[PDB]
Design a protein around this ligand. Structure first.
Ligand SMILES: NC(=O)c1ccc[n+]([C@@H]2O[C@H](COP(=O)([O-])OP(=O)(O)OC[C@H]3O[C@@H](n4cnc5c(N)ncnc54)[C@H](O)[C@@H]3O)[C@@H](O)[C@H]2O)c1
Ligand SMILES: NC(=O)c1ccc[n+]([C@@H]2O[C@H](COP(=O)([O-])OP(=O)(O)OC[C@H]3O[C@@H](n4cnc5c(N)ncnc54)[C@H](O)[C@@H]3O)[C@@H](O)[C@H]2O)c1
Ligand SMILES: NC(=O)c1ccc[n+]([C@@H]2O[C@H](COP(=O)([O-])OP(=O)(O)OC[C@H]3O[C@@H](n4cnc5c(N)ncnc54)[C@H](O)[C@@H]3O)[C@@H](O)[C@H]2O)c1
Ligand SMILES: NC(=O)c1ccc[n+]([C@@H]2O[C@H](COP(=O)([O-])OP(=O)(O)OC[C@H]3O[C@@H](n4cnc5c(N)ncnc54)[C@H](O)[C@@H]3O)[C@@H](O)[C@H]2O)c1
Lengths: 247, 247, 247, 247
């Protein structure tokens, strides 16, 4: 497929319901050689199973909250893939407390800190650590949400974290482009499995999107077919965002 | 390929350098079956040639300035492709006088009318005419330019026509989505074959995008791989638009 | 007030409910000297009457569909005001059949042409005709609607016309900037006096904006207080546009 | 003036060159009652002087890095102003090492933490603290920059923090709107005093904005004249942002 010959590190696979699983499958379907990371020991077995299914042996633990963990993981990785072609960053977190009720009341300095650190900085931290291992024509990709652009009830601080992320994309595309590295994001709509009857009613295509839809777009965005696209945030929400007062 | 089994009508092929030729070429490469239109008596020959180069015998005349020409064209195509699934709109024009010098001094009522008529209305005109022939999961695509979003010297009235066009994409996407049709646009950067060294020094990827770059993105957007995307204006300009003050 | 010593032309006053009446009032309150246009002879006496309340006796007829009517209006106006400080463009029109139902079905070539011509071209047509009469420090202002940025049911082809208009604002701002003229737009939210319950429910400030809200904004934009703002589309919709899924 | 009757707290006056100085001055001029804050001991002197200069005896210390200092500052302010009408947030910081060269090589986890903490969280942190003291009709305002929207060389991590800020503005506006509070930002262009040759040449108004221009917009935005504007980022850069390829 259009990714054959590409070596992509995939991040954030927690379940087969997870957006990253969908991204992995599509990428694998298109011919990519994949690597996986997992946050904690509890996840390892699971990740290992999926990886095999997808023809992979490369399963490394990585906690993006710690710079060491990051450096370690990419040292191990270089033993198998001394050069590779990018990675998919599908990681986000904010303390659940932050995610309910009045934003002004909910928000805290630490909650603010963590959300931003995990949800946005980790992206550039990862890029910082593997910069010399990336091949010309590599592509990095993260996942975002409408919440970065508009105020959405309860999304609260995550919204701010996502806005920081989408700016990280532009600053990374600008810095890394001259070395043949592309950086994009996908702003995904809400996914039925992983309000919605509102979303479906109002989304132009009249359905919510699927991990498959998201996965297909991600594959395209990490392949050479999208070589003229960098620093972009692509909406994969079935047009949900460009419609208004859809009675 | 990812377009196997799709019938796509391509408009505005007028030369081999043309953006539309790059689009036709990539689609063909991905398995699509093509049909072509040509504006006037003059081009028939060349177009007949290119078509044949891309395995097509469907070459029909179409002058978007006229309602009957479009209706007639679709009547003809329907003899051959009673159902199809989508069309690429790569048409635009402003009288040359409109395009040089101070925007306010250059613009005229007639130059304005025409620019908007051919460059923007024509897109919905075609949709309107083949609406019943479109298969569920069809995709419509048009071509745009940064001038729609920023004031660009000399782009003048064309900047206004492209803005209108971008809105058209949104309005069309919202109207046709419920029936299974997607509508998007590509905002392409300057193309070399088709200042350039400033543009390159300032584009993150450091080069101008090519008609291949554009054709590849177009193919994706017209394929089911992009089922989750509608009403979107995708920038294929190497990240030029998201940078500022680069030097 | 902050408009004292400024001479401003106001178009589109048809009633006391009209946004332009609202704007005229507020500007007059801040000390501007006003002049008015009216479209047809039927409107004449009502306008003369309002103008009188606002200390003006300059009431000229003007149909923006006619170049000649514009030129004639400014000729006449030049007799009293050989030099002035800007105008307020508050005119938009689309054949009513255009504004009901599925956009693709309702839109026609003539409807599209008219909507664009009256609603967008008229803005630059007026600028072009009075360019030499503007003082350094002048300001031009037009009115837009969220429909230019998102697909709104029934707004249909007016959406494309507002989009062409917002781009017209950027191209004019760029062309006229160097001679001391600023150009901007206000994107006004729905006005109760000009669904609304859903609107109020979802607007952050929890009420619809008023023509007073709009007028005060227009007044600021036309004053030297906004000297650092040109080419902008300012949203006066109480934050309606920056929120999502508030329902 | 149009601010007569209001009590506004002003942060970040560090000099007479400060954008914060230009705002206070303008606000003072429009008849507002001012209070001031200062970061540390060294400033007190300067600050106490400007305040005097603007008829204020209210000078309180505040280090936004600490929730403690903020709570206290407002405790103290409630002694003189038990209720007040909003504040202007003119605070930004990132370590200097962060702001030089390749963003990817420059950024650090700590440097990113600080920048977001001081430049973005501080804003909602103050709102949270004085929420109870705000009169209906209050207005909060913050200062931004183009770096939040586009990738600007050397602006680096500040661009991500400004992006977070602009989203904060939307979430704060959506949350506080229902109790009568409006929240907005100004995105100011580069200011000469406090390349510029480049900028001027390419800024539609052909000059860089001044602290007075910014101050005038801020005053309007904090007054009741702008009661219809909330959740908005107004660009006060002479239109710099909306032009492109300006030859
Ligand atoms: N769920 C949706 O509707 C939706 C819509 C748009 C975008 N997204 C985005 O996709 C990503 C999350 O994926 P998802 O929504 O499929 O859910 P998910 O729960 O499967 O994804 C989160 C993943 O992040 C990992 N993670 C969290 N903190 C980590 C840390 N410190 N170190 C290492 N890994 C860590 C978890 O282990 C997990 O696998 C985010 O970027 C989110 O904004 C989700
Ligand atoms: N040139 C650039 O840098 C650039 C960048 C982005 C977008 N574009 C877009 O590309 C398309 C133009 O194709 P291109 O750039 O390959 O070359 P081009 O400038 O030759 O495209 C114009 C095409 O429109 C056709 N056309 C014009 N008037 C017509 C009429 N009345 N009826 C029927 N067909 C008519 C012409 O025959 C021709 O094929 C447009 O969609 C334009 O917006 C150009
Ligand atoms: N009503 C709303 O909720 C809203 C919201 C945002 C923007 N606006 C905009 O404000 C302007 C109109 O004001 P309004 O909406 O208060 O209602 P309106 O119906 O009173 O505005 C239209 C005005 O345009 C004038 N006009 C139309 N065709 C003309 C022609 N050929 N020559 C000269 N004058 C002509 C009319 O005489 C009239 O005064 C438009 O630009 C419209 O898009 C309205
Ligand atoms: N410099 C420009 O051309 C420009 C253009 C647009 C926007 N801005 C914005 O205006 C604001 C600052 O104005 P500026 O750039 O003229 O001056 P600046 O860069 O000196 O602003 C920093 C100010 O923040 C204060 N500050 C820093 N850390 C603090 C802390 N821990 N607690 C309390 N106060 C602290 C300082 O005392 C100082 O007054 C920022 O929000 C910035 O982004 C500046």
């Amino acid at each position: 497929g259009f990714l054959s010959g590409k070596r992509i590190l995939v991040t954030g696979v927690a379940s087969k319901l997870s957006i990253a699983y969908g991204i992995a499958q599509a990428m694998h379907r298109e011919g990519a050689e994949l690597a996986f990371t997992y946050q904690n020991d509890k996840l390892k077995g699971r990740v290992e199973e999926f990886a095999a299914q997808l023809g992979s042996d490369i399963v490394l633990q990585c906690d993006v909250a710690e710079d060491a963990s990051i450096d370690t993981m990419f040292a191990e990785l270089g033993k198998v893939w001394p050069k590779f072609d990018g990675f998919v960053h599908s990681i986000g977190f904010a303390p659940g407390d932050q995610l309910d009720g009045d934003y002004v009341n909910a928000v805290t300095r630490e909650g603010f800190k963590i959300a931003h650190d995990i949800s946005s900085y980790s992206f550039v931290a990862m890029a910082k650590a593997c910069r010399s291992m990336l091949n010309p024509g590599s592509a990095l990709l993260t996942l975002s949400y409408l919440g970065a652009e508009r105020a959405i009830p309860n999304y609260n601080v995550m919204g701010l974290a996502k806005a920081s992320l989408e700016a990280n994309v532009r600053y990374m595309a600008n810095a890394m482009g001259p070395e043949g590295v592309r950086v994009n994001a996908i702003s995904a709509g809400p996914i039925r499995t992983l309000m919605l009857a509102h979303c479906e009613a109002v989304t132009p295509i009249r359905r919510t999107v699927t991990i498959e839809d998201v996965g297909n777009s991600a594959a395209f965005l990490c392949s050479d077919l999208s070589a003229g696209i960098s620093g972009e945030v692509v909406h994969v929400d079935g047009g949900f965002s460009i419609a208004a007062m859809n009675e």
